Write a protein that binds this ligand. Structure first.
Ligand code: NAG
Ligand code: NAG
Ligand code: NAG
Ligand code: NAG
Ligand code: NAG
Ligand code: NAG
Ligand code: NAG
Ligand code: NAG
Ligand code: NAG
Lengths: 314, 163, 163, 314, 314, 163
């Protein structure tokens, strides 16, 4: 009696320690290349920011009015999103973005700042609602009379809760020094911000800039995080965008950037800007910057694991 | 898969099998124990390598608004290093696993052969290419007694010994 | 550990041993050479894997006063990546070493068996499950001659050949 | 004669490439989980800072008077440690901390600054010794008469040694502008610091802050490292905390943060905040932030290496 | 008939999973230790900057006059290179260096700034050519009369090309406030720079510094990158080093730092400061900071791979 | 390389060979097939491990003008971590490859031996140390018939069987 092994006419080539191109009976893939060109959001609380920039949800330009108190397990940034209506920028913007992505949403709370002896309803043609408006969560602090002085004012807020609060203020950089003296009066203007982990103070830098959104003045957006039972102090005297409400982190989530469509039909934990990687394989060759619970990215496009024996045909 | 010079492409019944030709016709029937052993081992490899890491990685770059150049080049540097590491790990892992798989199948074939050899003690003799030359004409039911490991090691002994 | 269907739980004397039953009673005595070979190989594995890296890593984070959020998230990102790498390395290393250890012991058992088989040339015959059927009654001192590799391959030859 | 292998009634389960749960004769551990809840400091020169913050050893608040010239192979930070007595903060504090941890101690040397026409013995109720004192290694530079002017002063120091020197100065941010004009006189105050690798200049930001340690004014602490045969120049005119002595690194050491007790009975090279990892195993599952000469941290809590053969019992 | 294997009298010891010091027939090396003490530049376009600092190629001190528009595949920095002639420093210098190393060279283009009512030919004794000169690509903006005022000036430049432009300006920090009022007139001087991704504004910090290259005044060098079809705006009024021409990246290259000699006889892709690593081995033990296409650095100096069988001699 | 107690240092002709002594003198000639198999396998290992990664890494540090201390310590931290990883990978890789190489050569020797054993079926008998005791005097041309795998398994059979 004889005894042997099986074989096939068309085998599958793999690589080993010894050879490169050994023909085996059956093989399987270890590097995922298939992509789902959608953000698989089945079972998750998704917030698609759209034209609203992430940081904008803290300041509140018009395009973010429907995102001032969101709650999510998955936060999607969009390329068309804008953080500002009046031309400005955020100092340490990417750090605050990475904070807000895994925050699980935000929760506003009024800080309770009352002002005696100044005006408090600044607006502009860019931040537009019914007419000329402004950032929802902010207040443009000006002087009473077209052209007066600004009284050296001091405000303060204590975090009365158990999680760190998010404090965001602004510094106005007017188009000229004559316009700065028009809005806030002449003389040097100093903005001091202090707490238990914070020093700092700031002052403006008026001058002409590029016309963005119609205006040439800018607004610096600064932020800190108040620890529980810690107080924050603002000693200002002009060119000040005061915070109305502070922000509190809801819980935990994950932030992604993508340009594909949301889909509640498929489930996924590994996301990139092109879609979702739905796979059980240990490796992937689609995006090295994929976030979530992903297979490890490798440079190789294919690595075949042998599931059968050596194929020796007649 | 060594000196068994080729495989039986018609054995679509299993991995290893017996093919005999005595006097009562032809025979080709697969063996279940060895085939199932190799299948369970390869299955173990597959179930171990297919794995979902519960480790979650967050964003660190920014695709829409590029971060500062220095920290960006440090980030890109680190990501490329880790990519090199995982590429190496994947390559070596796949190659090693393939080697152990092939040598595993060869080992199982050798075990089947050695067992069938020891099951018939002096009743048959070795030839050269994975067959057993019978020196007593063994009918089909006796071949089936060899297959399910019930062939007797002495009740056909001197009859084939004198030959 | 293959067709030797089970192990001898009473053999607390070593890893591999001889258990015989002839006419002068019973016997069970361990073998020193093979056991010591496997023990030295496993010992080599242990002494190689137990290792203290002379590489010193300093602090980069701060547990009492958290560092800036951006550099902190880059640091956490890198540390988690390296943690993934070392977890993978540990897993694969342990699994591979275990495989080679088990197959190593099986190999040593097979070597012991094959040597004892070749030591007695036609004086005894193979049975099926790791025993040797003697065709000349071999007393206890002859069994001890088999153990310490001094049994003669011809001075009992035709006596057992005619049987 | 028969020949076989040994076995046991109660084996040990391990994992292989092929199976998961193979029973073997003997196995050993590869992931260390045992911890020693003490800082094993046997044979090492240890300095437990206690209530003294690390950076404080350069400035010299009261709680650091016994640490102005320490020498260590192991430096332990404590959570109760404070870097300041008068409320203030260090710019690039974590970098200076990481510098001082592996410095092996510090060595002070007088910089030799003599002042002609100003006062030089400022004090406050917070930095307390016999009465109202100040930072030991620092000098609060004020104006002569309650309320005068500050003469535009210029000082300089050359590093006359073979290792880089540590230069630390301060900028006073008074509670108000009236108090700043009281201490240093009216007018703009500019603090310029220059060398071969350094530009910079600074000026104050007066205003009200949170009451920390009783006071509302702050002090910025800045620092640079003078290369050998390089000179440092200070062009100042008010709101200046001048350095009395510069610091020099002694050698090499390691800094840890911990809340457990020092112990000279056990020896250790791997430390974390919970104690010491005394092990020869290649992996550990205790703290991913452990420092020193440690086994590599892994997520798994147990990985059993087979030291025996396959266990096949009757 | 007998059959056996071969052996040799002098074998080669290697390490395995099981033993340490097994003697085998033949072995080969896996860790490269041989170094070529030259910068192998065969077939590559090399630019050896020599005494010219990399960043200097953007500003144009005398020692960089022959590097204002270079083009390279390999850029070599030298230790004797100097980025400045007048004492100054670059803000975010290392980032700009890493940008310029892989730029493949630079391409200048005049920005077209015309000034009406000021002087524009500043010079100094340090930046020396025929006599007292200045940075080639820069213009020292002063006031007309020894001692006048500076008119609040505003300039702007739009990037009319398809790649980001490199904009570099300077801020003069004079030796004193009297010299600053001499050069640019009295009063506060504010330098504002704005675009689509940029805010900022700056002002000077006069005062005495260390005498470097003969002078005590400094110059801050700042830079940004204009996106295509984006405009940059400068609102200044004194202490201004204006840019004459902007820079554009040519393509792709690699930057190294080395002190060994260029050699067009050998070819290499892995470079370090000591020479070139010409090897096919997967590992190396020469420099952990080697750049290019290198073998992976390892701590071990030798790791022998067995190429023969076990050596069992008589 | 197991029970073949030592190697033949004079066999500078190949890896494996036949050395015989019958009546017509002495013999020592290498075997080409097995030697070439092992040589091709080791060659495969070498050609696979010698590899140039097309991945290019740029500078991130600065040797002439040291970067900021914090980012510098993060960079040094990451570089040292990756150095640890690649040192581990190199060590384990070399050790594993060496093990599989040695065991590979031993396997090829065993295959050569087993084939030569099965080529002569009952014409000769096993001795103990990798030799075959002939029971019919086989001249030099018959030994060469054993070498190139042309020795007949029956045309010398009963002549050596009666002995
Ligand atoms: C071959 O491998 C693939 C892997 O996906 C598996 O689905 C398939 O059932 C296997 N077939 C055989 C005949 O082994
Ligand atoms: C915060 O302050 C409130 C005020 O009474 C106190 O009840 C609470 O215990 C404090 N919590 C902490 C964590 O300090
Ligand atoms: C990092 O790499 C990405 C490509 O994955 C590239 O787009 C980006 O510009 C790189 N970062 C920097 C700072 O150049
Ligand atoms: C990094 O991880 C630690 C936990 O190990 C966490 O406490 C810390 O907050 C993280 N860093 C940041 C910036 O969140
Ligand atoms: C089993 O392994 C442990 C590992 O620590 C060792 O201490 C012990 O001596 C071993 N015992 C046996 C019987 O192998
Ligand atoms: C430092 O300056 C002193 C002054 O004479 C000189 O002797 C010494 O050689 C210098 N050392 C260096 C490193 O420049
Ligand atoms: C031994 O290995 C080296 C590796 O470089 C090779 O060049 C040489 O030809 C080999 N020699 C033998 C006899 O195997
Ligand atoms: C840039 O502006 C020019 C001006 O007409 C226009 O032709 C071109 O399409 C623009 N390109 C981009 C990318 O905006
Ligand atoms: C990083 O390591 C290098 C040695 O490779 C050392 O020269 C340098 O000083 C280290 N970095 C810092 C910030 O100390």
């Amino acid at each position: 009696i004889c005894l042997g092994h099986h074989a096939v006419s068309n085998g599958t080539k793999v690589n080993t320690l010894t050879e490169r191109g050994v023909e085996v009976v059956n093989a399987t893939e270890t590097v995922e290349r298939t992509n789902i060109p959608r953000i698989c959001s089945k079972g998750k609380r998704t917030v698609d920011l759209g034209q609203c920039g992430l940081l904008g949800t803290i300041t509140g330009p018009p395009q973010c009015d429907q995102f001032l108190e969101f709650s999510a397990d998955l936060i999607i940034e969009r390329r068309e999103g804008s953080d500002v209506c009046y031309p400005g920028k955020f100092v340490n913007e990417e750090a605050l973005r990475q904070i807000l992505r895994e925050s699980g949403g935000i929760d506003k709370e009024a800080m309770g700042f009352t002002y005696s002896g100044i005006r408090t309803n600044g607006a502009t043609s860019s931040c537009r609602r019914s007419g000329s408006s402004f950032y929802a969560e902010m207040k443009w602090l000006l002087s009473n009379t077209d052209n007066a002085a600004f009284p050296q004012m001091t405000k303060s807020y204590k975090n009365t809760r158990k999680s760190p609060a998010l404090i965001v203020w602004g510094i106005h950089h007017s188009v000229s020094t004559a316009e700065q003296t028009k809005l806030y009066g002449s003389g040097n203007k100093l903005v001091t911000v202090g707490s238990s982990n914070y020093q700092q103070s700031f002052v403006p830098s008026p001058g002409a800039r590029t016309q963005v959104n119609g205006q040439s003045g800018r607004i610096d957006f600064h932020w800190l995080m108040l620890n529980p039972n810690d107080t924050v102090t603002f000693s200002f005297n002009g060119a000040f965008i005061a915070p109305d409400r502070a922000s509190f982190l809801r819980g935990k989530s994950m932030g992604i950037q993508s340009g594909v469509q949301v889909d509640a039909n498929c489930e996924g934990d590994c996301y990139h800007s092109g879609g979702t990687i739905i796979s059980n394989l240990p490796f992937q060759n689609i995006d090295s910057r994929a976030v979530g619970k992903c297979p490890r990215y490798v440079k190789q496009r294919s690595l075949l694991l042998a599931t059968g024996m050596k194929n020796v045909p007649e | 898969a060594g000196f068994i010079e080729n495989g039986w492409e018609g054995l679509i019944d299993g991995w290893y099998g017996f093919r005999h030709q005595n006097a009562q016709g032809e025979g080709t029937a697969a063996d279940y124990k060895s085939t199932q052993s190799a299948i369970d081992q390869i299955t173990g490899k597959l179930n171990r390598l297919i794995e979902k890491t519960n480790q979650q990685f967050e964003l660190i770059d920014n695709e829409f608004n590029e971060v500062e150049k220095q920290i960006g080049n440090v980030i890109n540097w680190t990501r490329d290093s880790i990519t090199e590491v995982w590429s190496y790990n994947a390559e070596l892992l796949v190659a090693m696993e393939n080697q152990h798989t092939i040598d595993l199948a060869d080992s199982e074939m050798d075990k089947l052969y050695e067992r069938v050899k020891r099951q018939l003690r002096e009743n048959a003799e070795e030839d050269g290419t994975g067959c057993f030359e019978i020196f007593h004409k063994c009918d089909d039911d006796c071949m089936a007694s060899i297959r399910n490991n019930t062939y007797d090691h002495s009740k056909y002994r001197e009859e084939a010994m004198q030959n």
